Design a protein around this ligand. Structure first.
Ligand code: NA
Ligand code: NA
Lengths: 249, 394, 390, 256
């Protein structure tokens, strides 16, 4: 539905890309993460992308493997992840909240019973990291039956066949990994997500024609460096987020 | 999309990140081509026979069946070059890879047997081979690491948190993402995303074919049942394949029972797990109520996999195969029996299969039973594991 | 005796009188079994269905690149137990059973002959006792455990030197008293008659299989078969069938150690002197006044100061040609076969291999159909090769 | 030629068995071994058999295995033993001397040259430990060419075929070790064998007189006398006096 479309609207007639930070729900703890969430909004984050700690993250690199390990060994459950989402959505009822899921946490007790929960808590999108467009049919259904936008990675080895299917099936934004024609096929707006560490990389992305950028490792790399010092962690996130979102103006 | 069917009933699939899909599809296409090419079928067959040593022997147990009506044959994959049945699929995939133009093999290993399999096939077909190993297992396994390097491979220890088999698995997989044009990923079981279950069965199915032929020669009939251990499912599907349409032949797979099923530290997902999506596939796995992947336990490293190849899940759903479990202790006694009364040191994996055959015999000692147990591999690697248990026990 | 104890001048039964009855009884039992087609088939079923004969005849792929050498490897490393000794041990176990014997005695150093006798005894229901230098019992905990797992009884000898030549002493002392119930499993083709004959006969299927397989894959006999010669059993088992095929070279490779001129070798065939020892008249490394002198080689199995009597003979009549390979040539051949053929050879057999690469690289335009006897798996030599490389 | 016959003669004239000690030449050292040998003679040893240290003695047991390593490690050589033998023979021209040899030391550079050195220095008999009668032709030949008695062990698994062989080929004495032990001793006298000496486990004087009672001409003790030597390495003179005590008790156990 709307929260993503209502955001790329006002972002396009302010002539500016979107900045989406990525963080693992409940990392390093439930209460500290809530604060991390808010700091990121108050520093100028246009949308969120929250990950749900999973025992086995195939498709995430080193820094996100460890953030995932932090929250998981600490006991953060997917059920707790939803109680935090309810607090989040009710404090900032306008901001698009995407989820980064792993297939088995979606599939576990019904693909449909999942996407229902996302709808009723206020989530907006769901990226399933280990479900390619070829296996997506049952997730695209449950997604649409509950007004949840399915996000698909478009990789740099993508042929015209897949560009088609990402454009048709994909709503919200299209998460792409680094010069293209996804717009030609009427795809949801593209968000660059390959190696967004600098503000430099972010304006490199917008200048390249993207609707915005997502940085995962960079933002949680900050969490990792300041586990002992929760208040430093928050302040250093403010510096970074504001510095990045500003490189999109 | 997909030349071949990726599913076996519900189970199977290609549940992987989009970025990997071109590599799986190119792998599947190259494999379909080679399955039709008589020069590949001939070249592979020449390797299996003159380098690996196929056919392997089918040993009749003289002593341990005494005073019973059961006749126990042992299919001797322990005699295959490299000591285990994994050499079949490894030479197969190296052939496939040299055919695809690829010049590099990627692999990872835990205990280290698969690393050595890969390294030796890479050495033979002139492929540059790099093996990921958890930094822990590099300490534990200095002998294996040295064999791999003796054979030209490059062992790359991983430290990324964890630091065991399911963590090299990430570095090796991540690596493959970026180099599938140049390197083949040597998966080591009949599990994971399509086409790996199908390729692996096809490069292992000659175990059953030899066994069918060998038992027909010695006994003039088909066996009552074939028995094989089921960790990832590769040796079992290799023995089961040719018997699948011989309805009279019981297909029995043995999952590791750990310390007991009720204790919940086993490795028996087929019978005691739940379908979930993981390791690229939809398969029964051991998981918690909220869908985290549980840890499996077995005294045998080979059997210590929290899921199982999808074709086994399919065989169990339609009634063809019967899956049972055998505990550490049960497998321990089978292992000692075979050393003492047959002069064969089995691997602790195949020992689970042995133990279930002796159970079938010792429960009905007057039933006429012609059984085949697949001895998936040599037990020399397990001497220390076994010595420590027997020392602790006295 | 029933058969001829000599090969020309070499061989004999040079043992204390007390041991002659055991040896004659063994010979008579053997002569009888050799003419019983039911023994022959029993032995042959065992070799095929338990031990896994025939063994592969493998064609090197990369090793002979850019040369006209075609190099086959007879793969006794794939035999059950990892080495060619399984053949003679199963046959002796079968013969011991045929004689009513219920026990086996045996001697071991590094432990692989102990393991072979243990597994043959576990299969065939014999009660097996293995003598082993207490030195060698703590340097090989794994094989000791294997022999006990596969449980014979390992009797450690603390007499003088805890080494293989002092386990032979008590093994024999033991057989002396117990020959009516126990068979002594001599581990090579040396020693007193009928052992050099019995061992040849229970290994000759190596060469027979090779002749058949090579007549099948190349339609001709090979130019030369190459084997390392320590005790002499894998070599004579490779040679036996080819003795009457004049065209076929028989090349036996003794270990040159650090070099023949350094005196630390194990090549008594070409640099020793005929003497009497271990119950046979054979060339042996001996000091000027007739002490048996120490052999050296980095391969344990090749560290024998003498050689089987049939090789001394084949070399006297010039039918076989004996050369040497040094520690370091052998080492480099070990490394080559791992790196380029995916096979880890034993340090013994890699003396034979190394000589084949010498014959190849010195005449690489020359057409050569060579077979090399890979006498054993090399998983046992890893630590010896690891140290040596620092 | 002389000494074993002239000895066995007077022994049964004064009706008595012979006692023969075995020691290893140059054990524990050359100059100590000559003294050991003189003590053995002075305490009543009728003949003596000396072993030459060989690097790899098979037919031998643990006590003798080590006496051998002691002289070998000390670099006693066959040449040094032959010098000793001469010094020994020159001082007791009477007593029969037997060598206990290993084939290779006899064969090393000529069976015949070996036996001519024996005769040249005064030895009377050679026992080659690892030459059964079946292989003995060249050694017996060399022996008779040089008036050396060839000694042969008659073991307890010995059939009548071997007893006749031994009775024909042996000179000096039969070295003795399954029907009564006397029906080995009787069969040998029936075939007119050289007188029997029992050399199986002769360690205490009560075994020496048991050996003479069963009908043997005497008794040999290998390890028992060598045992005393190993016991007293630290104490060279206590050794000589423990051997004097032992040999005289041994020789007295044979005064019937
Ligand atoms: Na499993
Ligand atoms: Na030698």
């Amino acid at each position: 539905m709307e929260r993503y479309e209502n955001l790329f609207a006002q972002l396009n007639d302010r002539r500016e890309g979107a900045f989406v930070p990525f963080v693992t729900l409940g990392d390093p703890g439930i209460e500290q993460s809530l604060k991390i969430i808010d700091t990121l909004i108050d520093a100028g984050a246009d949308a969120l992308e929250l990950g749900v700690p999973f025992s086995d993250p195939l498709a995430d690199g080193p820094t996100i493997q460890n953030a995932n390990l932090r929250a998981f060994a600490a006991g953060v459950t997917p059920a707790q992840c939803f109680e935090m989402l309810a607090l989040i959505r009710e404090k900032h009822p306008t901001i698009p909240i995407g989820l980064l899921m792993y297939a088995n946490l979606v599939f576990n007790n019904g693909i449909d019973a999942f996407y229902a929960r996302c709808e009723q808590v206020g989530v907006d999108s769901v990226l399933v990291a280990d479900v390619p467009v070829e296996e997506s049919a049952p997730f695209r259904q449950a997604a649409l039956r509950h007004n949840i936008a399915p996000i698909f990675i478009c990789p740099p080895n993508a042929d015209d066949d897949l560009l088609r299917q990402v454009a048709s099936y994909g709503r919200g934004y299209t998460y792409l990994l680094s010069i293209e024609k996804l717009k030609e096929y009427h795809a949801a707006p593209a968000l660059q997500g390959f190696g967004i560490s600098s503000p430099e990389q972010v304006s490199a992305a917008v200048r390249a024609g993207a609707a915005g950028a997502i940085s995962g490792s960079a933002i949680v790399k900050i969490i990792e460096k300041n586990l002992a010092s929760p208040k430093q962690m928050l302040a250093e996130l403010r510096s970074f987020v504001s510095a990045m979102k500003a490189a999109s103006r």
